[PDB]
Amino acid sequence: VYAQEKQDFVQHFSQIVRVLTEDEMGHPEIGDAIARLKEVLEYNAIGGKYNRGLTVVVAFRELVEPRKQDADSLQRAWTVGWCVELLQAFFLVADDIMDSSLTRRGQICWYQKPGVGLDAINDANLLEACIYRLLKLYCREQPYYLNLIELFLQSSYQTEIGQTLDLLTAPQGNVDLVRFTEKRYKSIVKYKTAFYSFYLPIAAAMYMAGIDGEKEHANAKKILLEMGEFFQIQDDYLDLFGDPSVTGKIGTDIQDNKCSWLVVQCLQRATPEQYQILKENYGQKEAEKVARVKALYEELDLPAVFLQYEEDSYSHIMALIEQYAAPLPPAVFLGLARKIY
Amino acid sequence: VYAQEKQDFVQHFSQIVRVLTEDEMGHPEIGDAIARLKEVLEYNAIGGKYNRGLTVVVAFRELVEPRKQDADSLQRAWTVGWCVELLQAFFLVADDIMDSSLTRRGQICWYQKPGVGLDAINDANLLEACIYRLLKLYCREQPYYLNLIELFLQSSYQTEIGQTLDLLTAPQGNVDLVRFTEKRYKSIVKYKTAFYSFYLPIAAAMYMAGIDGEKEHANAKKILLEMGEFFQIQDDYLDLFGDPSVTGKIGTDIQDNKCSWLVVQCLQRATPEQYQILKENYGQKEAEKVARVKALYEELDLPAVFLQYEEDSYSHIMALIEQYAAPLPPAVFLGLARKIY
């Protein structure tokens, strides 16, 4: 799936940048704004793994009768993959400002760069706008055009709703473990992460392939949101117990008063002595006050609970594919399941 | 035009809020996010003059054979007027954060409210998203639907480009009067202000009326961007010389190193002794260092130059209406000209 197509996907980026910075090279006056847009694109859409954009391309190839896969159709697939990556970039540039993060993908967040600061708010908005310029440039005469506009807009709105929910639930600075519930956790994950990361890219490829039916989309969505829930739970687990030289990351969830899967589980599993030890330790600078939490999680066998959850979640996802994939090829879904499990 | 329709326009807001906060009252889990959205709407879309949203409604009535003006068509007109107002609210909430403003419409900027801060970035994004939820809810089955989606997206992109240009030109903190040129001034005004404030609302009403032709839109646009340039120049003039009890405002353009029409004119009109006095005084806290600028503007008869510019600009706009209005009724344009002149 992914290895093969990546090459061609990253290489199409240069052309994405050309087209977005040259439709107004017949408008001299905005030159300097266009140069800034170029810099925003290059700094922020490049450097991740591209899993979500690639999924568009892979899914497209599995879905479209190979007969209808000319140079032009593939180019639209790469472009729409890149749109998912721009949606992503928009969210991250903006979330980094909202969180006051320092780095992203191990480099300095865009807004932290000397001379950028809160101007990054407009930069993020430009990234979002670039999605719709690409659709128009590449897809306006296709019959799925309006379907794709609506899917991207809807994906943005769900992501934003999810973000609002996260922000209400989990202010960086206010412990109130009372709001860290399971129903709320699943909610945040579904809106903030699973819709754009898992439904968006397959749905887009579905539409490019003519599969516009509400039912098919409802069916695919059911499988994909469930995958997205697992992916994020695995992210929360690995934030703390992952090997840091394996993730390339080192987690700060507990420091940041995150509504992690772990703390939800913890709060289901605690006697009151534990809750206090959690109330008094969740989310401080102090390393040893974080130690007390990682230790308490271990004392409640959350690694084992996770291991059990992952086995169950994998059988459950497989039954969902059995049940809801048709008439799409199960491979569209199984390729993603292999990637995350 | 405006007096009559305002009543019904402001009153439709309640229903706009209902619809946007009730499509997910069948989704309990996001309840708290929806309540926050309600608060964001009420605080930020209400309290201005509504001139741009109203223009949609007025233009619509002048453009549509009265025969096709049923309850449902008018309701769509009010809704699309409200969309222009949401686009506006989105821009202002975000610009206020980028500028570090304190107040807006004489009340505390949204991001300055205790508990909001940089979460306002997501709030602004929700306001933007609300535009497309309204179009979908109210207009998805109309034949102009995709035309309106594209117009709002394009209006956002132009506004953002304009903002970027402004931000590059005029950093709050770096005097470099070398970048304050006429061509650059007109550019910022056109992209950042005139397109969404003047072309957007009439264009939208044009599409709702079936007038989708590129030529008609090109013609209308030519008149409306020229009006937008005057409106902003008049804004820059009045920022400094307006009667404050008449504007309800009191201008800080010079303090903020703005690329005002005034400083552009000034720089065309200065001997070097003056440029230095401008280089050394443009854009400080100090009241007396601002006094020296308002005084220097008066010493170059910029009030008279403005008065001349406004006479010329009014003849020029009238000739544009003569030439480019048809086959739209000149009144669509003349009502706006009466409002701004």
XYZ file of C-alpha atoms in Angstrom:
682
model
C 0.000 0.000 0.000
C 2.005 2.944 1.504
C 5.726 2.449 0.757
C 5.075 2.348 -3.074
C 2.858 5.415 -3.395
C 4.707 7.768 -0.999
C 7.434 8.605 -3.459
C 4.945 9.952 -6.018
C 2.809 11.648 -3.316
C 5.607 13.722 -1.766
C 6.896 14.569 -5.209
C 3.492 16.026 -6.289
C 3.890 18.634 -3.493
C 6.166 20.770 -5.610
C 3.417 21.050 -8.173
C 0.766 21.819 -5.472
C 2.999 24.706 -4.395
C 3.487 25.889 -7.994
C -0.194 26.030 -8.732
C -1.026 27.818 -5.520
C 1.658 30.422 -5.928
C 1.273 31.060 -9.668
C -2.518 31.566 -10.272
C -1.637 35.077 -8.863
C 1.699 35.642 -10.677
C -0.617 37.485 -13.091
C -1.492 39.684 -10.021
C 1.890 41.402 -9.208
C 0.561 43.439 -6.272
C -0.046 40.436 -3.978
C 3.417 39.010 -4.701
C 4.688 39.353 -1.152
C 1.574 37.674 0.279
C 2.017 34.801 -2.151
C 5.694 34.365 -1.136
C 4.555 34.221 2.505
C 1.983 31.577 1.548
C 4.723 29.553 -0.069
C 6.818 29.687 3.110
C 3.742 28.708 5.202
C 3.096 25.720 2.970
C 6.626 24.434 2.971
C 7.228 24.789 6.638
C 3.904 23.262 7.770
C 2.617 20.694 5.197
C 5.963 18.957 4.934
C 7.746 16.814 7.525
C 5.019 14.442 8.866
C 4.364 10.840 7.740
C 1.560 11.762 5.265
C -0.514 8.770 6.324
C -3.827 10.487 5.866
C -3.079 11.964 2.386
C -1.584 8.707 1.244
C -4.691 6.885 2.338
C -6.631 8.872 -0.205
C -4.333 7.694 -2.962
C -4.182 4.062 -1.895
C -7.940 3.905 -1.333
C -8.522 5.473 -4.709
C -6.524 2.826 -6.507
C -8.327 0.018 -4.739
C -11.738 1.549 -5.569
C -11.502 2.691 -9.129
C -11.745 0.210 -12.018
C -8.086 0.341 -13.207
C -9.511 1.290 -16.632
C -10.499 4.751 -15.330
C -7.053 5.460 -13.763
C -5.372 7.767 -16.284
C -2.685 10.390 -15.639
C -5.339 13.014 -14.884
C -7.377 10.912 -12.400
C -4.283 10.020 -10.396
C -3.154 13.585 -10.305
C -6.533 14.533 -8.808
C -6.053 11.734 -6.261
C -2.611 13.087 -5.220
C -4.088 16.612 -5.086
C -7.007 15.549 -2.855
C -4.551 13.587 -0.675
C -2.611 16.816 -0.350
C -5.806 18.580 0.628
C -6.256 16.255 3.552
C -2.650 17.106 4.530
C -3.423 20.830 4.306
C -6.468 20.404 6.496
C -4.190 18.719 8.953
C -1.580 21.477 8.768
C -4.259 24.111 9.372
C -5.408 22.297 12.519
C -1.943 21.781 13.883
C -0.611 25.253 13.328
C -3.635 26.558 15.150
C -3.691 23.957 17.928
C -0.012 24.633 18.623
C -0.842 28.254 19.234
C -3.814 27.320 21.462
C -1.640 24.932 23.547
C 1.361 27.070 23.666
C 3.447 24.251 22.278
C 7.168 24.756 21.548
C 7.868 22.050 18.960
C 6.012 19.840 16.482
C 7.644 16.936 14.584
C 10.631 17.800 16.678
C 11.017 21.294 15.074
C 10.007 24.718 16.280
C 6.304 25.369 15.923
C 5.505 27.851 13.174
C 4.040 30.464 15.528
C 7.196 30.282 17.686
C 9.396 31.355 14.819
C 10.902 34.798 15.225
C 8.691 37.264 13.303
C 5.610 35.020 13.066
C 3.849 34.838 16.420
C 0.094 35.392 16.254
C 0.239 36.132 12.508
C 0.189 32.331 12.389
C -3.539 32.584 12.911
C -3.951 34.046 9.494
C -1.331 31.622 8.137
C -3.460 28.746 9.384
C -6.475 30.213 7.781
C -4.633 30.388 4.455
C -3.762 26.719 4.679
C -7.432 25.971 5.076
C -8.287 28.151 2.124
C -5.726 26.346 -0.039
C -7.823 23.189 0.207
C -10.645 24.813 -1.692
C -8.378 26.480 -4.262
C -6.942 22.990 -5.116
C -10.393 21.397 -5.396
C -11.450 24.120 -7.685
C -8.334 24.051 -9.825
C -8.275 20.308 -10.144
C -11.777 19.009 -9.623
C -14.373 21.699 -10.530
C -15.538 19.873 -13.612
C -15.798 16.495 -11.927
C -19.179 15.228 -10.787
C -17.965 14.624 -7.192
C -16.758 18.249 -6.800
C -19.502 19.490 -4.528
C -19.414 16.207 -2.626
C -15.736 16.836 -1.830
C -16.315 20.483 -0.867
C -18.998 19.429 1.605
C -16.860 16.613 3.032
C -13.930 18.890 3.729
C -16.190 21.582 5.243
C -17.952 19.015 7.326
C -14.642 17.498 8.429
C -13.456 20.918 9.553
C -16.584 21.625 11.516
C -16.418 18.239 13.326
C -12.807 18.722 14.125
C -13.532 22.180 15.500
C -16.385 20.904 17.618
C -14.149 18.265 18.947
C -11.537 20.815 19.744
C -14.033 22.967 21.620
C -15.040 19.883 23.621
C -11.442 19.184 24.401
C -10.839 22.785 25.467
C -13.838 22.769 27.766
C -12.873 19.372 29.223
C -9.215 19.695 29.699
C -7.979 23.278 30.269
C -4.136 23.266 30.534
C -4.149 24.449 34.236
C -7.450 23.286 35.825
C -7.638 19.798 37.332
C -11.273 18.703 37.559
C -11.173 15.004 37.116
C -14.983 14.976 37.402
C -15.156 15.921 33.724
C -12.810 13.023 32.570
C -15.407 10.418 31.763
C -15.553 7.648 29.249
C -18.516 9.005 27.285
C -16.673 12.398 27.060
C -13.388 10.827 26.105
C -14.967 8.912 23.198
C -16.744 12.020 22.145
C -13.605 14.110 21.962
C -11.818 11.396 20.031
C -14.544 10.897 17.546
C -15.041 14.570 16.659
C -11.526 15.882 17.054
C -9.543 13.004 15.558
C -11.380 10.045 14.037
C -13.605 11.853 11.557
C -10.805 13.726 9.721
C -8.090 11.110 10.210
C -10.042 8.032 9.295
C -13.411 8.780 7.656
C -12.292 11.823 5.629
C -9.634 10.172 3.520
C -11.485 6.976 2.534
C -14.772 8.964 1.973
C -12.954 11.285 -0.339
C -11.635 8.423 -2.389
C -15.081 6.865 -2.337
C -16.545 10.017 -3.928
C -13.818 10.275 -6.465
C -14.808 6.742 -7.391
C -18.527 7.444 -7.846
C -19.529 5.805 -4.577
C -21.660 8.631 -3.240
C -24.392 6.633 -1.484
C -25.389 7.640 2.042
C -25.570 4.039 3.080
C -22.124 3.057 1.828
C -20.708 6.152 3.517
C -22.596 5.378 6.721
C -21.170 1.834 6.574
C -17.619 2.842 5.915
C -17.901 5.548 8.631
C -18.982 3.015 11.200
C -15.823 0.988 10.643
C -13.513 4.004 10.352
C -14.619 5.909 13.501
C -14.080 2.690 15.480
C -10.556 2.440 14.075
C -9.965 6.068 14.958
C -11.000 5.421 18.559
C -8.467 2.551 18.840
C -5.716 4.615 17.166
C -6.088 7.408 19.695
C -6.336 5.065 22.693
C -3.163 3.489 21.479
C -1.669 6.928 21.198
C -2.601 7.707 24.862
C -1.147 4.355 25.997
C 2.076 4.847 24.082
C 2.440 8.475 25.164
C 3.383 6.959 28.572
C 4.573 3.331 27.964
C 5.868 3.462 24.442
C 9.536 3.107 23.983
C 10.654 6.686 23.291
C 13.324 5.550 20.800
C 10.484 3.645 19.047
C 7.868 6.469 18.994
C 10.472 9.217 18.369
C 8.313 10.910 21.032
C 8.248 11.199 24.831
C 4.825 11.821 26.343
C 3.647 14.728 28.476
C -0.076 13.835 28.689
C -0.251 13.628 32.488
C 1.570 17.036 32.939
C -0.919 18.677 30.632
C -4.112 17.563 32.468
C -5.046 15.600 29.304
C -8.175 13.609 29.008
C -6.102 10.548 28.179
C -7.618 7.096 27.907
C -5.333 6.182 30.806
C -6.774 8.687 33.309
C -10.325 7.705 32.273
C -9.481 4.046 33.062
C -7.689 5.041 36.219
C -10.755 6.916 37.445
C -12.949 3.890 36.777
C -10.465 1.761 38.747
C -9.668 3.845 41.778
C -10.585 3.541 45.425
C -10.721 7.015 47.051
C -7.139 6.858 48.458
C -6.066 6.567 44.782
C -8.361 9.427 43.498
C -6.797 11.825 45.997
C -3.334 10.658 44.976
C -4.542 11.372 41.474
C -6.251 14.670 42.367
C -3.018 15.758 44.112
C -0.620 14.623 41.315
C -2.391 14.838 37.940
C -0.834 17.476 35.852
C 2.121 19.207 37.474
C 5.572 20.253 36.329
C 7.198 18.054 39.007
C 8.738 14.826 37.521
C 8.222 12.865 40.799
C 4.545 14.036 40.953
C 4.215 12.572 37.443
C 6.133 9.496 38.624
C 3.495 8.896 41.271
C 0.859 8.778 38.469
C 2.825 6.471 36.066
C 3.494 4.321 39.076
C -0.250 4.337 40.056
C -1.248 3.389 36.568
C 1.187 0.463 36.754
C -0.289 -0.530 40.189
C -3.679 -0.817 38.496
C -2.283 -2.961 35.562
C -3.304 -0.474 32.913
C -0.676 -1.938 30.550
C -2.491 -5.284 30.843
C -5.912 -3.612 30.548
C -4.679 -1.915 27.426
C -3.341 -5.213 26.067
C -6.745 -6.784 26.672
C -8.489 -3.756 25.132
C -6.327 -4.015 22.014
C -7.122 -7.730 21.485
C -10.850 -7.079 21.909
C -10.721 -4.014 19.668
C -8.973 -5.941 16.935
C -11.592 -8.799 16.926
C -14.277 -6.120 17.056
C -12.853 -4.218 14.044
C -12.490 -7.418 12.039
C -16.201 -8.226 12.654
C -17.045 -4.762 11.527
C -15.162 -5.219 8.298
C -16.894 -8.614 7.767
C -20.221 -6.934 8.313
C -19.947 -3.454 6.731
C -17.224 -3.369 4.122
C -19.258 -4.740 1.222
C -19.500 -3.787 -1.469
C -16.142 -2.068 -0.962
C -13.146 -4.401 -1.031
C -12.239 -5.385 2.521
C -8.670 -4.425 1.655
C -9.453 -0.730 1.774
C -10.100 -1.222 5.450
C -7.651 -4.003 6.163
C -4.680 -1.917 4.930
C -5.497 0.693 7.562
C -6.058 -1.951 10.239
C -2.558 -3.397 9.467
C -1.069 0.071 9.725
C -2.519 0.794 13.196
C -2.420 -2.671 14.875
C -33.539 50.562 1.810
C -31.923 49.844 5.248
C -34.163 51.248 8.014
C -37.180 49.095 6.841
C -35.438 45.736 6.514
C -33.235 45.874 9.647
C -36.032 44.993 12.010
C -36.725 41.691 10.228
C -32.989 40.979 9.711
C -31.966 41.252 13.373
C -35.038 39.309 14.383
C -34.093 36.341 12.108
C -30.900 35.940 14.211
C -32.744 34.069 16.917
C -33.745 31.484 14.364
C -30.164 31.288 12.932
C -29.016 30.478 16.469
C -31.786 27.893 16.955
C -30.945 26.006 13.817
C -27.243 25.982 14.521
C -27.626 24.792 18.069
C -30.387 22.221 17.516
C -29.253 20.082 14.494
C -27.071 18.453 17.264
C -29.661 18.346 20.097
C -30.110 14.806 18.739
C -26.354 14.376 19.598
C -26.311 14.763 23.458
C -22.557 14.216 23.832
C -21.531 17.476 22.109
C -24.007 19.509 24.181
C -21.373 21.566 25.959
C -19.613 22.412 22.680
C -22.920 23.526 21.203
C -23.636 25.780 24.226
C -20.188 27.344 23.736
C -21.014 27.900 20.058
C -24.192 29.655 21.077
C -22.264 31.993 23.386
C -19.697 32.659 20.601
C -22.463 33.550 18.176
C -24.301 35.876 20.484
C -21.307 37.731 21.723
C -19.661 38.227 18.302
C -22.311 38.376 15.504
C -24.472 40.841 17.384
C -23.783 44.502 18.164
C -22.511 45.981 14.840
C -24.575 47.911 12.255
C -25.238 44.859 9.999
C -24.688 46.915 6.862
C -23.155 44.104 4.891
C -25.813 41.454 5.766
C -28.582 43.928 5.168
C -27.163 44.713 1.772
C -27.809 41.136 0.786
C -31.457 41.484 1.700
C -31.994 44.879 0.106
C -30.144 43.865 -3.057
C -32.170 40.694 -3.239
C -35.452 42.551 -3.196
C -34.339 44.935 -5.903
C -33.152 42.037 -8.109
C -35.808 39.408 -7.851
C -39.091 39.723 -9.771
C -41.442 40.395 -6.799
C -43.422 37.354 -8.020
C -40.634 34.999 -6.866
C -40.364 36.573 -3.362
C -42.255 34.137 -1.128
C -41.745 33.479 2.590
C -39.098 30.851 1.825
C -37.023 32.975 -0.609
C -36.857 35.871 1.835
C -35.860 33.613 4.646
C -32.947 32.379 2.513
C -32.046 36.025 1.850
C -31.972 36.833 5.605
C -29.957 33.638 6.205
C -27.364 34.502 3.529
C -27.212 38.066 4.908
C -26.455 36.495 8.263
C -23.740 34.435 6.631
C -21.986 37.562 5.485
C -22.219 38.784 9.110
C -20.700 35.519 10.353
C -17.851 35.824 7.895
C -17.292 39.252 9.308
C -17.400 38.031 12.907
C -14.867 35.307 12.104
C -12.465 37.892 10.667
C -12.837 40.308 13.523
C -12.497 37.864 16.360
C -9.310 36.659 14.760
C -7.935 40.070 13.781
C -8.500 41.307 17.335
C -6.294 38.532 18.601
C -3.635 39.274 15.947
C -3.616 43.010 16.854
C -3.853 42.570 20.506
C -6.889 44.805 20.596
C -8.736 45.452 23.884
C -12.211 46.453 22.686
C -14.427 46.160 19.608
C -17.752 48.024 19.196
C -16.803 49.578 22.473
C -16.976 46.215 24.367
C -14.275 43.831 25.468
C -12.912 41.742 22.633
C -13.980 38.112 22.834
C -10.446 36.771 23.304
C -9.904 39.225 26.191
C -12.754 37.754 28.172
C -11.682 35.894 31.283
C -11.520 32.170 30.410
C -11.392 32.599 26.617
C -7.962 33.806 25.541
C -6.455 31.870 22.639
C -9.385 29.419 22.584
C -10.909 32.253 20.557
C -8.946 30.915 17.625
C -11.112 27.869 17.524
C -14.178 30.019 18.274
C -13.404 32.063 15.178
C -13.045 28.964 13.158
C -16.484 27.807 14.304
C -18.021 31.066 13.171
C -16.567 30.454 9.752
C -17.899 26.929 9.719
C -21.386 28.165 10.618
C -21.574 29.918 7.254
C -21.478 26.619 5.435
C -23.878 24.871 7.823
C -26.470 27.649 7.098
C -25.991 27.417 3.325
C -26.482 23.742 3.502
C -29.503 23.870 5.772
C -31.214 26.597 3.835
C -29.929 26.535 0.291
C -28.679 23.018 -0.639
C -31.522 22.380 -3.026
C -31.285 25.745 -4.742
C -29.512 26.023 -8.077
C -27.176 28.809 -6.828
C -25.933 26.689 -3.877
C -22.498 25.872 -5.206
C -22.175 29.408 -6.547
C -22.673 30.733 -3.004
C -20.256 28.215 -1.461
C -17.548 29.286 -3.897
C -18.232 32.994 -3.340
C -17.902 32.721 0.411
C -14.740 30.583 0.126
C -13.285 32.961 -2.375
C -14.198 35.951 -0.207
C -12.407 34.361 2.730
C -9.289 33.648 0.755
C -9.112 37.244 -0.588
C -9.637 38.657 2.823
C -6.890 36.443 4.208
C -4.498 37.435 1.461
C -5.235 40.995 2.176
C -4.595 40.443 5.816
C -1.244 38.817 5.108
C -0.343 41.836 2.962
C -1.328 44.141 5.748
C 0.706 42.159 8.280
C 3.784 42.225 6.088
C 3.354 45.950 5.360
C 2.478 47.336 8.680
C 3.845 45.353 11.661
C 2.593 46.958 14.932
C 6.165 47.961 16.087
C 8.325 48.423 12.942
C 8.344 51.807 11.203
C 9.510 51.386 7.608
C 7.696 54.030 5.711
C 9.383 52.754 2.529
C 6.710 50.060 2.324
C 3.741 52.576 2.627
C 3.066 53.170 -1.030
C -0.047 53.937 -2.962
C -0.053 50.755 -5.050
C 0.339 48.737 -1.774
C -2.318 50.693 0.037
C -4.890 50.058 -2.719
C -3.917 46.455 -2.764
C -4.480 45.949 0.935
C -7.820 47.709 0.747
C -9.059 45.770 -2.180
C -8.223 42.306 -0.829
C -8.738 42.838 2.870
C -11.848 45.023 2.827
C -13.549 45.807 -0.480
C -14.101 42.293 -1.788
C -16.008 40.969 1.266
C -17.628 44.258 2.272
C -18.820 45.404 -1.103
C -18.627 42.704 -3.799
C -19.609 39.746 -1.583
C -23.029 40.929 -0.514
C -24.364 42.166 -3.876
C -22.825 39.105 -5.699
C -24.587 36.818 -3.312
C -27.905 38.451 -3.988
C -27.134 38.365 -7.690
C -26.718 34.569 -7.530
C -29.801 34.093 -5.478
C -31.543 35.948 -8.279
C -30.236 33.762 -11.116
C -27.721 36.331 -12.320
C -24.708 34.047 -12.453
C -22.941 35.452 -15.527
C -19.207 36.127 -15.318
C -19.630 39.357 -17.180
C -22.376 40.770 -14.972
C -20.320 39.808 -11.925
C -17.193 41.344 -13.437
C -19.206 44.527 -14.093
C -20.737 44.760 -10.677
C -17.315 43.983 -9.109
C -15.699 46.846 -10.946
C -18.145 49.310 -9.418
C -18.130 47.723 -5.954
C -14.331 47.473 -5.429
C -14.091 51.170 -6.346
C -16.718 51.972 -3.717
C -14.824 49.871 -1.209
C -11.639 51.838 -1.878
C -13.461 55.146 -1.187
C -15.140 53.740 1.949
C -11.808 52.767 3.459
C -10.077 56.021 2.485
C -12.911 57.805 4.161
C -12.414 55.589 7.158
C -8.676 56.535 7.324
C -9.548 60.245 6.983
C -12.207 60.099 9.667
C -10.058 58.015 12.013
C -8.123 61.299 12.532
C -10.467 64.219 11.565
C -13.880 62.786 12.198
C -15.805 64.212 15.035
C -15.458 61.534 17.726
C -19.008 62.129 19.016
C -20.121 61.604 15.375
C -18.093 58.419 14.625
C -18.574 56.975 18.149
C -14.862 56.237 17.604
C -11.527 57.957 18.266
C -8.708 56.964 15.930
C -5.357 55.392 16.762
C -4.093 54.774 13.195
C -0.904 56.834 13.508
C 0.073 55.144 16.874
C -0.296 51.748 15.282
C 2.049 52.341 12.289
C -1.003 51.854 10.013
C -0.811 52.040 6.303
C -3.464 54.745 6.340
C -4.423 56.676 3.236
C -3.201 59.745 5.122
C 0.409 58.572 5.578
C 0.522 57.442 1.923
C -0.525 60.977 0.858
C 1.826 62.528 3.354
C 4.744 60.561 1.926
C 3.873 61.704 -1.589
C 3.774 65.298 -0.305
C 6.814 65.572 1.899
C 10.121 67.345 1.514
C 12.860 65.471 3.441
C 12.616 67.679 6.587
C 8.998 66.406 6.792
C 9.880 62.678 6.146
C 12.296 62.726 9.079
C 9.669 64.406 11.240
C 7.452 61.588 10.068
C 10.109 58.872 10.469
C 10.755 60.168 14.016
C 7.051 60.500 15.031
C 4.967 57.916 13.146
C 3.614 55.403 15.512
C 4.506 56.036 19.139
C 2.618 55.950 22.417
C 3.417 59.640 23.049
C 0.352 61.931 22.453
C 2.567 64.935 21.493
C 4.547 62.722 19.025
C 1.162 61.903 17.464
C 0.255 65.601 17.664
C 3.267 66.430 15.527
C 1.870 64.071 12.827
C -1.782 65.342 12.930
C -0.318 68.802 12.829
C 1.946 67.876 9.830
C -0.970 66.420 7.978
C -2.855 69.683 8.542
C 0.226 71.663 7.298
C -0.011 69.721 4.040
C -3.830 70.375 3.668
C -4.728 66.709 3.700
C -8.279 67.606 4.803
C -8.608 69.635 1.585
C -6.913 66.902 -0.475
C -9.371 64.452 0.976
C -12.279 66.786 0.192
C -11.064 67.012 -3.398
C -10.545 63.231 -3.530
C -14.097 62.636 -2.309
C -15.648 64.909 -4.981
C -13.617 63.215 -7.721
C -14.392 59.753 -6.360
C -18.094 60.480 -6.294
C -18.184 61.673 -9.981
C -16.031 58.667 -10.837
C -18.392 56.190 -9.103
C -21.434 57.744 -10.753
C -19.802 57.274 -14.206
C -19.114 53.714 -13.292
C -22.728 53.107 -12.425
C -23.801 54.778 -15.721
C -21.431 52.511 -17.572
C -21.548 49.127 -15.776
C -24.755 48.744 -13.828
C -26.940 47.523 -16.684
C -28.753 45.307 -16.797
C -28.959 45.525 -13.003
C -31.049 48.415 -11.697
C -28.776 51.353 -10.912
C -30.507 51.522 -7.538
C -28.706 48.453 -6.267
C -25.548 50.488 -6.517
C -26.939 53.919 -5.786
C -28.323 52.808 -2.389
C -24.802 51.859 -1.332
C -23.336 55.060 -2.773
C -25.874 57.097 -0.688
C -24.911 55.136 2.399
C -21.157 55.828 2.071
C -21.095 59.393 0.611
